[PDB]
């Protein structure tokens, strides 16, 4: 009875695997064997932002590549100057278990959310002095993992209830709900043009979504354990997944299969964060073994290590102009590098 | 000097922010943060009621505050989360004293596996668990006047023969004490099997009418603090 439908689902899996195999006769490395290696990349902690009491789950850059928001489990959103090390704002949260923070692309707003299932929107550029709460977005049944502003009125929030949700900030009501993953969703990455976003979850699968209706375009399944971080390539035709099987992998949307895996035997801890630089030649991944590794995204070898953190690296970010990378960490310190 | 007047008053702003961050750091370190774990059968909510007497629809975490002797405790019961917990449990690596509550009267091997997985979890090591072997009364009626036995679901209990008890309750029947000790021993076997020194488990025999559960967290907590101070003052 029902086993007929499940067997036909297995046959659909078989045909999908056959198609993905037939569209590949050469790996990324063969096509990019003759490209010049990046050499050794050395990056030094130019600034060090301190002031967070507890571990830092998330940081998000501003679009001006100078402002920076970070969330910490003491329950602070702090906004930094990151040129000078000044604290532009220090917002206290109502729930001190925030897993994510986002900074509006205009620079007007920050959202944090976290283990309270609500995405709180904070208004920075108020005519009034203090940063007050725009609204709370309460429609998720599991902790918020990631949140990204599309604009001042649309934010995509990932959750531990296995669903991503698109919101309308004026109304506070879900414009769309994305409901494909079986394991809870850990990271989120809007496309460069904000027509799509990839989503990595605790089912070891990444899903490409279309944020116009709310249906999954593609599913990418190459990892072994659950996927902790995702990030589109600058192009928008690829993305890198930072997983818990101690690997990073590059998937591309158009071929729709894995391109390379960025792994080395010495690494036996999970990835916590990924980021590309500006040209996508340089994938930066944070690890549980306390130090970010810089990956040549086209050779698949390490070139450079951001080893300066006492605890695990919980977040990463490259500036929109690419001048800097900031790494937060569970030791409660943010470091800017160049 | 080499920065304008705008930069000056910006730095005055950042320093005024440091002043508030320091006041909050003084608030944040004098408070002890307890993660309360447990199952559906465990009297977890009743223990929370016990500290409340001692002290919003889809809320994803709960939070109760109590103080024992001028020390602020801050207990984080988990609310509307899903069944899987290998991610949101990492948020509690730097808490004092996970408070694990189990249903003693029994499902008990499920509690043993929960304890074993909390204990051996990276990012949850270095946290000392405080077992509340709950529902002791129900365990008494289940053993002393019951057909259900611990010999099944746990074959190595027929050959148990209680160790020399220090000072049980006078009303406790030898069999009641034997089972009550076997269950606690069953948990402490996991506790001592892998957590060498950075870990302690503080078992207790608590009931639904137990009005000393707040103090038994204070004493354990005090002792968990003392071990941390011993390692950070280089005294050990």
């Amino acid at each position, epitope marked *: 009875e029902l086993d007929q439908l499940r067997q036909e689902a297995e046959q659909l899996k078989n045909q999908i695997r056959d198609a993905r195999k037939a569209c590949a006769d050469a790996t990324l490395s063969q096509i990019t064997n003759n490209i010049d290696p990046v050499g050794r990349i050395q990056m030094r902690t130019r600034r060090t932002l301190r002031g967070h009491l507890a571990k830092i789950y998330a940081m998000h850059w501003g679009t001006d590549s100078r402002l920076l928001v970070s969330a910490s489990q003491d329950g602070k959103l702090i906004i930094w100057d990151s040129y000078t090390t000044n604290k532009v704002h220090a917002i206290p949260l109502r729930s001190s278990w925030v897993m994510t923070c986002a900074y509006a692309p205009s620079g007007n707003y920050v959202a944090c959310g976290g283990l309270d299932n609500i995405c709180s929107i904070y208004n920075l550029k108020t005519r009034e002095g203090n940063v007050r709460v725009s609204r709370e977005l309460a429609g998720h049944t599991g902790y918020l993992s990631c949140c990204r502003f599309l604009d001042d009125n649309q934010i995509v929030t990932s959750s531990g209830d296995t669903t991503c949700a698109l919101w309308d900030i004026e109304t506070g009501q879900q414009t769309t709900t994305f409901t494909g993953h079986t394991g809870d969703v850990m990271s989120l990455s809007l496309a460069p043009d904000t027509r799509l976003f990839v989503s990595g979850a605790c089912d070891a699968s990444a899903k490409l979504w279309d944020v116009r209706e709310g249906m999954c375009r593609q599913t990418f*399944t190459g990892h072994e354990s659950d996927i902790n971080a995702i990030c589109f390539f600058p192009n928008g035709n690829a993305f890198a997944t930072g997983s818990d099987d101690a690997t990073c992998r590059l998937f591309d949307l158009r071929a729709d299969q894995e391109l390379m895996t960025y792994s080395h035997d010495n690494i036996i801890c999970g990835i916590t964060s990924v980021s590309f630089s500006k040209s996508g030649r340089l994938l930066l991944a944070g690890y549980d073994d306390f130090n970010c590794n810089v990956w040549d995204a086209l050779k698949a070898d390490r070139a450079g290590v951001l080893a300066g953190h006492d605890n695990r690296v919980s977040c990463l970010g490259v500036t929109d102009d690419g001048m800097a990378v900031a790494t937060g960490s569970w030791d409660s310190f943010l470091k800017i590098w160049n | 000097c080499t920065l304008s007047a705008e930069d000056k008053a910006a730095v005055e702003r950042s320093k005024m922010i440091e002043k508030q961050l320091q006041k909050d750091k003084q608030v944040y370190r004098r408070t002890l943060r307890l993660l309360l774990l447990g199952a559906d059968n465990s009297g977890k909510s009743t223990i929370v009621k016990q500290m409340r007497i001692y002290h919003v629809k889809t809320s994803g975490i709960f939070e109760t505050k109590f103080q024992v002797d001028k020390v602020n405790f801050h207990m984080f019961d988990v609310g509307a989360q899903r069944d899987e917990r290998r991610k949101w449990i990492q948020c509690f690596n730097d808490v004092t004293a996970i408070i694990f509550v189990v249903d003693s009267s029994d499902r008990l091997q*499920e509690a043993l596996n929960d304890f074993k997985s909390i204990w051996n979890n990276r990012w949850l090591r270095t946290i000392s668990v405080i077992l509340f072997l709950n529902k002791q009364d129900l365990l008494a009626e289940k053993v002393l006047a019951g057909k259900s036995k611990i010999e099944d679901y746990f*074959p190595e209990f027929a050959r148990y023969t209680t160790p020399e008890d220090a000072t049980p309750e006078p009303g406790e029947d030898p069999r009641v004490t034997r089972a009550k000790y076997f269950i606690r021993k069953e948990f402490v076997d996991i506790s001592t099997a892998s957590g060498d020194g950075r870990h302690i488990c503080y078992p207790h025999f608590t009931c639904s009418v137990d009005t000393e559960n707040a103090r038994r967290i204070f004493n354990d907590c005090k002792d968990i603090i003392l071990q941390m101070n011993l390692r950070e003052y280089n005294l050990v």
Partner: nanobody
Amino acid sequence: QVQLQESGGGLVQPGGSLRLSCAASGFTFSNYKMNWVRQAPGKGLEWVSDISQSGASISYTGSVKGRFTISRDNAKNTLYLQMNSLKPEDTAVYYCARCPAPFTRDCFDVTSTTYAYRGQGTQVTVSS
């Protein structure tokens, strides 16, 4: 993609010896502490056997002590469960579950109503 296909299962008599199997693909097998979990009808999942990464540390639920044996051939990517003297109460559907993350000694939420690195399962029945 992480696959775990169980084998075995059937209608053994109350006392018979029925051997389960578990083909595994899509992950490097040797690095995970795998499990056996079963779901007796009308009840939630319970954990049964807990073979380690290399076959060293092994644990059982009390009710299957001595009766059940777990092995794993990391070269054949396969998990096993030797069921003997199958008393007429362990007639559950039997799932082959996996550790969430490699290089680890604990298994969070393996018996979760939702878990993703579990298996389809197999059924065991008794009395006929």
